[PDB]
UniProtKB/TrEMBL annotation, chains A, B, C, D:
Name of the protein in its database record: L-threonine aldolase
Keywords: Lyase, Pyridoxal phosphate, Signal
Keyword Zinc attached: no
Family: Belongs to the threonine aldolase family.
Keyword Cytoplasm appears in the UniProt entry: no
Length: 362, 362, 362, 362
């Protein structure tokens, strides 16, 4: 048995998705003739509260397009977080493709930026021609590096007021925006109301194989077409991929709560072990991610034992569970849940954790 | 009835493709865990005679990655054709994304570059620190703007000898490389032997919904991984798309000849009309493209009548055929054939052409 | 003795210039406090018929700033000549710094672009989102690679009408704009009336050691300040350099005619030699440049003998004149006159030419 | 009377400089024919312990060239300080011109980077293909935003050891490197030994009108020639500017100590006032900069009164001193000394400060 808790991208297509792709009325998206792409775009337009949307291959390109479509002035700056995906895990494309300066701000605890330091950054070069013009504030809901932490609607409101005052636009990396709205029990459009543009991934928690989109005003999405074309994302018969995305877009309000519940149950069960090696605050688990603090054991070696299977595991637990994880920081590991991790898989991992912890118990 | 001859991109998935997508063993390609992507990559590596390949969303990104991975020096130049796809229909991404200077050379007749002007250009900045360092010679086989003209193997050899002498690499835009190998009756690797890297489109004549790849040495493809990731093409479960691509890769050497025959038959049938309005030399038709010279009628109005249907069309011909075409030059229109145009569709178009020409015969 | 006819950049400061630099009321140009910079900027503003000007280190940066300030849209194109300085001798900075696509057009004979091919290029992507947006037409008066050929006021008018129709701006590389206006006997502002922006070099024919400027509307020059700052041209006490430039700006209408007369006299004297090796049409000499066609002798080797001095030269001519030149094409060499070449130096070179030609006379 | 303490850039040419410019043996530096440029370059090479140097218009271009010549890989990162000049006051040219990602680290107190956060950053993407390749560590000696704080030789050594271990190069922004070497009483080459490249400004404390240079190995400076040419800094007769630079380079080890003494004396005199409004620790004054902490008064209004002159100022002090200063932070102002501020000017400022403080003493 294998429980892959490394990321929510490993979701494989389900039966409904696989048929939807093969039963998809397709066309040339470059000519604007794929109806299944057109459906996904307009369904997500109402879901996200934006005028238009634009299907893109990845959410990485979705962010790259947004930065390029907002930060167009030569000498423009984006205000972003120090541990957001755009700054860390996107090859620095803000500079090597967009040519836009980045001023990162701290946000590690709760995925939020200090609105005082935001005001300080938005005002330092508010008019001076000696400083780059900050034209975009980049937010991440949920924040992946912080542990899937939800950004409150109130924090979203304040950021925009501060940004829109100093003449800057607001984009939200909504790679896990459905996870945030599921946790807050609010419609997803209430989080995007306080934004100019948004990104949205289908390949993560929703279960789709490939797909993402940019959302915003009709003009911003119209300018986004040329940027998607130039970056290499002008696919032809992409209604094959939009069909599976439409299925997961409809199954979000029933699949994602299960991943949050499995995350909470795991965090509780791991806390009920009281081990000096591993510590988890079940209240930090806001969505489908559990950040486990490891002490005394290198996070890489803990993952190695959770993935390994020994005869003694079959002695105490009875099963052979290979728990797959990623070491996140130097003292922590990250587990992420999805629709392909069952609730009994969650219990199987907890028992694998029990065995592993006891073997390395101080 | 409707015959879409605007481009070979409008190829829609067949039943075998649609089943292959839904029956695909998929995984996270970003982690290198999609086996169907690995299969398509390894099959095309042997087909093209390259060490490795890399599945990308479009051939536009495949070309962009090749330029970026070859023209890396600050102050680098690419030698390309004046009417090649990279120079005209890719939003100038060689400059706005790659930051690479372009020196275009004429290529309109046969898709070939004058080896004298190439040698002169390769020598002007061979050592001078006042000129950019030419690091890539960009070729297009087949050449789309010229009418799918095939580049001879000997011409390919000479270009490399001239380039490899002055320390430049050779990339071939093989968006229609399978069409070239079918016309030349040679395996595709014999055209790529005289290259460092190559591009290869699946979404055109091969019938796939989405997909392309970059080919070359293992080192070049390893550098291509970061460029695909940074440009936004690092998809996750892309074995869904690779599965349909594998079907078209196996059906190419039997589907594309039918498209060449339909193109030749159409050009002949148009030549057997002897009309002063339209003229086509059936010897210029080397592949699946027919460049029709228009006289007396603006090329846009010819396309409008071929798509339109009138009561008199049902009087003279008996059917209602909507032939879809794109005006190409100021005095010509471009027709491109694919697997979704049947041989009787070609005859239906020829009859629609007859009617249109006869109404405005002067 | 030495007559350097390689370029007009080798002009060394005169006595009036050297005192003007040492007697210059200077200040911090970055703070806008250098009055000698302010004087040169406003004097050139009236001279060129522009609202404002901006002193820059080189004319290379002046062009780079103009392209950046006009071609600001992501996916913008500049229409320029194939043998203009921006395309050939500026390290392809239109792409590697500005990130702007370049569509070069032929202009070799008279430095003019075929207005039909200009219309064709300005219309091909006039609205299509598949093509880059042409936002700048780049002209060169005089054209250096063509042999200092003057662009007529009428040709300037037509280009602008064609450009301003399709919503593009016009910049003129006026590195030798005073040479053009001196030849046409018109004030320099009459050539810039048909332009949006202009460049202007002081280090060439005017005699200054360092300096250039960008001219245009007050907004374009205000946006140019940030671009000059970012590229590294925000000098501090540059009134030292502006003072020498103001001297040459006042001495242009008395120094430059002498360089044109010496060029014509040389071309005549060389034509009155009737040598099969060298040929010069004295009517192609429009300004201070003479393009000498060489046949039977590699242009590099002719320059080597003109620079060399032998005992036999002292036998036939009596003097030891080292004529310094540049081989320009594969069958031509380029001579350029300036204020540091005297009229007797011109006669000394012609005699050195006589001797050299006779030694290699077929 | 007027004391300009806003920056050390306002240094105006002295008589020896003004004579040196007018007595300069100049030539075309682009052809490598300006001997005075060659002299300044060779003298600074021995002074800084580098193989070669390259005269550039500004130190902004010198830094831009260094970043471009080090951070050349597509997907490269520079490790720099959060308040360093490259990150704040250079229009983000690291991205909008160089296309290089920036990971800034805190440095506000002592201008030093936390070697733990540096090691952590140098290891996060030491091999991972998901992270940009860190190729340059950027240091600033002295650190301008921190108040001219000197970086110790030992701290410089450790940074290189950490960088050279993880395969990164070290560049030092030596805009005020002579101020650092005067404070440390060491030859300047001992600070540059722990570097690959360095920058060096002449227009600041040294007194020159215009000029700076890049230093490093012969190969790095050879690559710097094309970058200086492409950015627009390839001047012709720059021995005019190099001549004045040679004067300040020889007068540095006797002029800069006077500026350090005036800064210390001022800070002491301000400390001997014991005012609740303004506070300065004279031990933070390491060079020619005094960071004055302001309380109760917005820093802008303090500068307005120090520049203003009233009848009561002539009543209490007897003179009319206009002290020119820049508000630096939200609670501080920055004073910088240079050769054009005399020791009695410092006493006149201190008396102007006394008056201003006493009027608003609470
Ligand atoms: Na997925
Ligand atoms: Na297709
Ligand atoms: Na000069
Ligand atoms: Na100065």
């Amino acid at each position: 048995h294998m429980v892959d808790l490394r990321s929510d991208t490993v979701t494989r297509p389900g039966p409904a998705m696989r048929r939807a792709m093969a039963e998809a009325v397709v066309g040339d998206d470059d000519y604007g003739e794929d109806p299944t792409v057109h459906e996904l775009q307009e369904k997500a337009a109402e879901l996200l509260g934006v005028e238009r949307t634009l299907f893109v291959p990845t959410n990485t390109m979705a962010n790259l397009i947004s930065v390029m479509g907002h930060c167009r002035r030569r000498g423009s700056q984006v205000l972003l977080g120090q541990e957001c995906h755009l700054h860390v895990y996107e090859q620095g494309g803000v500079a090597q493709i967009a040519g836009v300066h980045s001023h990162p701000l701290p946000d590690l605890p709760y995925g939020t930026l200090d609105l005082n330091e935001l005001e300080r950054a938005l005002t330092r070069g508010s008019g001076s021609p000696y400083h780059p013009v900050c034209e975009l504030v980049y937010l991440e809901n949920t924040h992946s590096s912080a542990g899937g932490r939800v950004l409150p609607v109130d924090y979203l409101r304040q950021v925009c007021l501060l940004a829109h005052a100093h003449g800057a636009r607001v984009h939200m990396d909504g790679a896990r925006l459905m996870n945030a709205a599921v946790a807050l029990r609010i419609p997803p459009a209430r989080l995007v109301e306080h934004c100019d543009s948004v990104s949205f991934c289908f390949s993560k928690g929703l279960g789709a194989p490939v797909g993402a989109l940019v959302g915003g005003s009709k003009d911003f999405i119209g300018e986004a077409w040329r940027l998607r074309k130039a970056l290499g994302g002008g696919m032809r018969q992409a209604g094959v991929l939009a069909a599976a995305a439409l299925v997961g877009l409809a199954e979000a309000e029933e699949v994602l709560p299960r991943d949050h519940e499995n995350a909470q149950r795991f965090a509780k069960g791991l806390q009920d072990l009281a081990s000096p090696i591993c510590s988890v605050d079940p209240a930090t688990v806001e969505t489908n991610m559990v950040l486990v603090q490891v002490a005394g054991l290198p996070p890489s070696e803990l993952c190695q034992r959770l993935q390994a299977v020994s005869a003694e595991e079959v002695a105490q637990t009875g099963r052979a569970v290979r728990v797959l994880l990623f070491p996140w920081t130097e003292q922590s590991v990250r587990a992420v849940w999805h629709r392909d991790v069952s609730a009994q898989d969650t219990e199987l991992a907890l028992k694998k954790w029990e065995f592993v912890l006891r073997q390395l118990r101080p």
